[PDB]
Structures are given as C-alpha cells and as structure tokens.
Symmetry: C3
Subunit: 314 residues, 3 copies
Amino acid sequence: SRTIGIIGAPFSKGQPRGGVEEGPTVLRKAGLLEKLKEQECDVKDYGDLPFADIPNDSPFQIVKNPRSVGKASEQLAGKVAEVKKNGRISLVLGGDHSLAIGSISGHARVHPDLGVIWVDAHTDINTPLTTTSGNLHGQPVSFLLKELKGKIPDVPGFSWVTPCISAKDIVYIGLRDVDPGEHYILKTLGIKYFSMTEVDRLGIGKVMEETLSYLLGRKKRPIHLSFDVDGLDPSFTPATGTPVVGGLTYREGLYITEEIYKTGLLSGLDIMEVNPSLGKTPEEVTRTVNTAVAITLACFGLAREGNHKPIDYL
Amino acid sequence: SRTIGIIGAPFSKGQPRGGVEEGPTVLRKAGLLEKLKEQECDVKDYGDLPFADIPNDSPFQIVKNPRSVGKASEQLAGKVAEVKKNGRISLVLGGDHSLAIGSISGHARVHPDLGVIWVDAHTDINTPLTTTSGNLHGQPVSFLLKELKGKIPDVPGFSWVTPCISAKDIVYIGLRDVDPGEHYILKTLGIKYFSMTEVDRLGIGKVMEETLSYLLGRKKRPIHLSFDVDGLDPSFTPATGTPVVGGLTYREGLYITEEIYKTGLLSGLDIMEVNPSLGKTPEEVTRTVNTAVAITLACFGLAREGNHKPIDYL
Amino acid sequence: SRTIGIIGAPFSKGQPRGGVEEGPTVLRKAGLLEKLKEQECDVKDYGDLPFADIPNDSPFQIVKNPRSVGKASEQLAGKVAEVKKNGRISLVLGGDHSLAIGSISGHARVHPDLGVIWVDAHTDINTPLTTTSGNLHGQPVSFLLKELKGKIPDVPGFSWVTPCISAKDIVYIGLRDVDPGEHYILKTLGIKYFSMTEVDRLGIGKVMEETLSYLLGRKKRPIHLSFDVDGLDPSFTPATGTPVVGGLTYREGLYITEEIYKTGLLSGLDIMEVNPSLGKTPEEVTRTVNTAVAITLACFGLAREGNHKPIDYL
Ligand SMILES: [Mn+2]
Ligand SMILES: [Mn+2]
Ligand SMILES: [Mn+2]
Ligand SMILES: [Mn+2]
Ligand SMILES: [Mn+2]
Ligand SMILES: [Mn+2]
C-alpha cells in the first residue's frame, strides 16, 4: 500500500492571479482525503502551509515577488522532506507552480536519486534573465537544474536553493507553448520531452513507455510527478491561469498517472494551478476541480478497468 | 446483403428512470428504417414488443422489478429467436440493458456458437448478491454466463433463463466504472476486456484487431454486439441514465462498428439506454439519438470512406 | 527560410452561402501577415483578387455559376503562377474550394511535378455529370485530374483548364462524407486516401508517414496542400458551409501541417471555406478563424515543442 502526506500549499505570488491560493481548499471540499481513504490509502494531513506575508518585496530586475515565492518554497521544502522522512508520498495541493522549486528540493534532500515527470503545456524553465513576464511560476525548473547553474542570478529569497536534479533526470509531457529561450535550453541541455506533437505522433501509450524506461532503465528510482492542471486541455480544466488550446485529453491525463501509479515508484506529486476564481461559470470550476481529483486518485490506485480488495467477492 | 429484423423493445424497469421506454420511438422518428433502406438493406419491422404490466412485483431481497424485467426478457428472446429463424439480423431498439438477457438468450437458442462484443462504460456483471442498487440493467451478463451458474439466486421471473454464453465468448470495450465485485468476477472468470485504459494504450485500431481475432480466431461464428449508448462519451450521448466521463469517441464508436460490419458476421445487435427524457436540452436529445442512429447504420454498411453500388457511375 | 506570397481570393460562387467571400478579410484582421513575420518568414502580399461580376451566368445543365467560378479560377491561377515564379510559397486565403482548380493549375504551370495533399471531409471529385447539387466547390478535383478527362463536359468558363495532376499524385486526409459516384471514382482511379476510418485505425502519425512516402518516395517534389477548414471537426471550425461530425482534431490538424512543414517541400497552400457569417455566435467565428490561423502558422514553421533563432539565448 502507498501512504500519502497531504501538504496544503496555498500560494499565488508566482503569478498575477490570486484565486489559486484557494486551491487546497476547493480540492479538500471536493473530498480528496475521503476519496483516497476509500482505496487502500493511508492518509495523514499535514494541514495547509500558512505562508507568511512579505510586504516589502519589490521586483528583482524584472523578477516579481521573489522573497515571498522563495520563502514559500523554502517552507514547503521542509514539510515535503518531513513527510518523506515519515515514509509517506508527499501530495502537494498547491496554488501556482513556483512551489515546485521547494517540492522537488525538499523531496531530493531525502531522495537525491529522484526522477521527475513534468506534465504541462509550458516547460517553466525560464531563468531570471530569459523570462519576459517575471512570474516565477514559469521559472521553477531553471532553479532546480544543476547544469543551469551559473545562469540564474542571486534572487533574494532563493539563496537557500541548491540545484538538485540534472537535465538528464526529467521528462516533460504535453508541451505546446514554449518560449524561444526555453526551447534553446531544452535542445542545449538535451532535455527529453514529449510535446503534444510527439503525443500525436506516437500516442499516449508509447510516450509513457518511453518516459518510464527513460527514467527507470538503469535503476528503479523514486518518481516525482509535478502535474500542472493546464497540461490538460482547457475543455477539462478551464479554471487555470495560463490555458492553451489542444491539450492532453481527460483520458490521456488518467492514462499518464495510472501508468505512473503502476510503477509503484511514485514518491512525490504536485497538483497545481487550479484557480476556482478563473471559472467562467460555476460548472467550469467544478469540471476543473473534479478532473484534478480524478487524476490524484489515479496516482494512488484508482483504475478504470476496476479495483477490488484481496478477498472472495462471490 | 444483410437483412435486418427490427425488434422494438420499450422497457425501462431495469433501472429507475422511465424515459428509456420511448427509445424505440425516438429512434424510429429519427428515420432508422428509412436510412437502412437507402443502403443495400432488407428491413422487416417486427414492431414494438408490448410488454405487459405486473403491478405485484415487489423486490426480491434487493433485486428490483424482477418479474417485469424477467418477463420482458422472456418476451424479447422469442422474437429475437423468431427473426433469426427468419434469417435476419435482429436489431433490438431497446430501453434499458436488462433486455440483453433475453436478446443474447433468444439469439443463442438459434445460434449457440455466438460471440458477444459488449460496448459499455460498465460491465453489467453484478449478481443479485453482489449488486448494491438492485437495478437489473447492471446485472444482465451474470444471468447469461455459464460459469456464474450457482452464484445467482432464483429471481422470480427468470426461471426460464439458462446461461448460454461462457466467460470465454465475450469481450468488453469501453470500461471505466466497474464495481469491486464485478472486477473480481472479471479477473476470476478470465474475461477479456478493453477498458478505456487499454484503448488509450493500444488505440481503437489494435483493440478491434485483438477483439475480432479473440472471438473469430478458431472459427467464424455469429457476432452479437450489445451496444450501450453510455459506452460513448457523455459529449456524444448525453441523454442516458448512467453517463461516465472519458468515454469512447464518436469516431471510436463508428470505428468499432464499421469493423464489426466488415467481418460480415454480425447477427445480433442491441442499441440501448437512450433516454430522451434525460436531455438537459432539446439538442442533447438530438445529439444522443443521432449518434445512436449513426452507429446503427455503420453496423449495416455505412462507411465513412464512402459507399457505391456495383455499377459504372461514370 | 520559406517565403510566402499571400493571394487573397474573395470568392463564394462555388456554393450557395456568400459570407465565405469575407474570408481573406477575417484572416487578415486576425493577424496572419504579422504572425508570419514574427517567424523566419518573408511575406509579400499580392492583395485580394478583385473577382469580376458576371450577371449573365445561368446554369449549365445543373452546374451553377460556371463562368464566375471558371473566371475566378483563371484569375487566381495566374497570380499563383506569378508568386511561384517569384520563388515564393503561394498562400491562397480563399472563400470556397472551387478556387482550388485555379490554384493547383497555376501552381502546376510552374511546377508540373507537384504533389497534392487534400485535407477535407469530402473528396470534391464530382463531375458536372455526377454532381447532385451543382455547387462547383464540390467538383474541383475532377477538373484537375488527367484520367477524368473525357468525363467532364465543356463547362462555360473552364475551357482554359487543362487537367494537370494525375490520380496518382494526390492524397486525401479526413474523409467521412463522400457521394456514391465520387467513391466509384476513388476506387476506379485508384486514388490513395485516408478517411477518418484509417485515421482511427492507424493514427495521425502513421497516416502522415504513409502520405509523405507515398508522394515523396520516388523523388522530392513540391507539395500543394489544399486545406478545407471543414476537414477539422465542427467543434474547432464551426463557421463553415458544409460541416460533418467526427472530424480531425485541433491536434491532428496541427500535426498534419507541422509534418508538411518539416518536409521543407511545401510550395502551394490553400486555406478555404471559412465563412464568418455562418457562426452561431461571435466566438464560433473566433474559434474558426483562430484555428485557421494556427494551421497556417504551422505550415510555415510554428512548432508546438518550441522555436528559437540560431543564437545563444543564455
Ligand atoms: Mn506550470
Ligand atoms: Mn503550464
Ligand atoms: Mn449497460
Ligand atoms: Mn453502461
Ligand atoms: Mn472542400
Ligand atoms: Mn469539405
């Protein structure tokens, strides 16, 4: 059985829109804990991380709210490390994706040999020098990669960071809106990726086959799945800040994670960018959150073909 | 050419919702007969089966309306057997899926070597002892399978039944909402299935290849396709009682059946669970019924690439 | 780098609906030129072709507005030939698909060894004798094929035409609504096609592999892609005259063209049948045109995985 450690991370300062903070809340009000308990899941809730307020957080060059973002990630990282030392799969119900910096870091401190599957429409690998917006939810991967060391300036609030994963230990799935500099980084750092073009070409099945062998071919190491709800199509997860048309299917999102589950190697998981305040209607909020819950439950066992306990049902 | 024998089965007592009874009506008002005639189809309509009224039909344990359901199925079975003896492909335009018990049975009486392709979101293999609802439209397959003999209690109104197909002669396509006991039965009776996870993995093409060789590998036996409109996604067939997200595509539904047609071995066909009364809007009823008609016409020849008679069009 | 030559073709007399004329306008107001310039694209706009008015254009047998259609195509053909002699990829932003007759012809005059990929829900290969409607936007391919010579009557306004491509040099992708006579022609002239049934079966990836080797196997010849917006599903391009359910995906449409781009052999391109006047709502017009623009930009380099200039972004 796989034990979970819910880490509620109500943070939004990684981008403009604020309703992303109430994500852990809407996901819990959906029933995530209870639903996980109906399965063979042992759940321990480490509550919501009460991220402080830093009023004096002016921009660094063009980088926005660095101290708040860097501090929320430093806070998240210790909890993730805590739950992992507790022998539990950390489930970070977050707001924006900047929290990944602290999630992968915290996870790597206890499991330095971790592998990352990054599901998203964007690569989020911009540096403080290549970013055009400044929103740090589009910059996490650059703070985490060892090879991109020496190319990221000293962002106030991130001094604590130490690049933990190398470009060879991460796979992207779902790309379709990647900036010029980010693309340069991908081809230059030789990052394996499966944008929507490769999903179309090879199919969701082949893509997973290749991503799992790519990361577990040499050995069987822990897997960190950082899932951004906008990796899925905006017809399934509309309530998100940066939606891009032509996304992963509801089916593909479930296939992605059922396969991840099946490796039995999941150790870290992030479900981010669900902003109920961005729903056009009340049902759009519902369609977004429900899809978010469904993918979470599949990361922990829920299979479409069916599930049954080890007993004689007849 | 393939001759058809329309058997209108207006029945709903296999579940709570009643608008499923007016299914044969909405499908006929759509033009099914006329549309089939535009093809190389010979159609003979055996009318709608006037299912009696059984007022004294209290529950059996938790099993609901057994005598009505068992009687409608006993009635349907003879007609199906009748049309088959008439050398015609029985087309059961039904209401709920409990009618399958009588459809496969009636068909098997004349063709005991039949194979079944069950398109659905559910396996409908609950027994009177494993069911939680009691609705018999979620129990048909258990009354039909020989191996599940000795595990189904004597349900008033079903004494006439004799398990006709063995767990080895049926394939499910489209699963994604299967109960714990049903799943136990699947793995225990070794039933071949293709839930949405396998469709995602292998593709709709591979799935059909495997289902047709699985059933026709040894010999070329008659094929009974029991099609539940909710096997398709709720974006194509919304007007149905038990819709589950992440279903088969409009395209996949047409691919399924064009391939079935192409075997030239179709002998039995059911198009069930279309409930026009469950439409949120008038167009949802239209989208459901039209999709239902489209899949029917493909079971009898209509191909997307085109169709032409044996003559010189130029 | 690939240079473009925009040929605005505001014509509608190939079918009943007139709002297709304002297609070049809505596509330009969307930003097609500007967007192409953000890429490594050299764009030269040859303006909109001012198609004359022919009031005395009564039907030929059942063929409608032949002189206007034949004259608009004769006009378009010279411009296409002009831009091609200018060493530029002709981009015909049209109205209805009858304009293809002049587009492929004009293109073939300068590049007789051209190959055609025809993306559509229909084959548009009806002759003046096999057509039931008379709308010439459903007849273009028959005027262009050499083998169908002797089977098309002398349509006033088309005398200038000379069949330029043979049945062996064209591939259809996306078919699902083909008439009996057209189908006869396909099987008789041995035209390679990939209707929606083959896309479902083999996948969009395999389909392109086979279409590109089918046309470029012997040599590397110029490619003419005639793209009809209704080849895509009506959920992506609703504002079109003849929409048919179960079309190509947004993703598949982008995959089709990214692959075409990647051959580096695109020379001719048509983006037709966008009729903003057929939108049910203002956003349907937007969804249609935006999808139209997206596919255009992919024909000229825009890749979902990302794009970057030959420089050191770090
Ligand atoms: Mn992200
Ligand atoms: Mn994203
Ligand atoms: Mn059913
Ligand atoms: Mn069902
Ligand atoms: Mn066309
Ligand atoms: Mn068309």
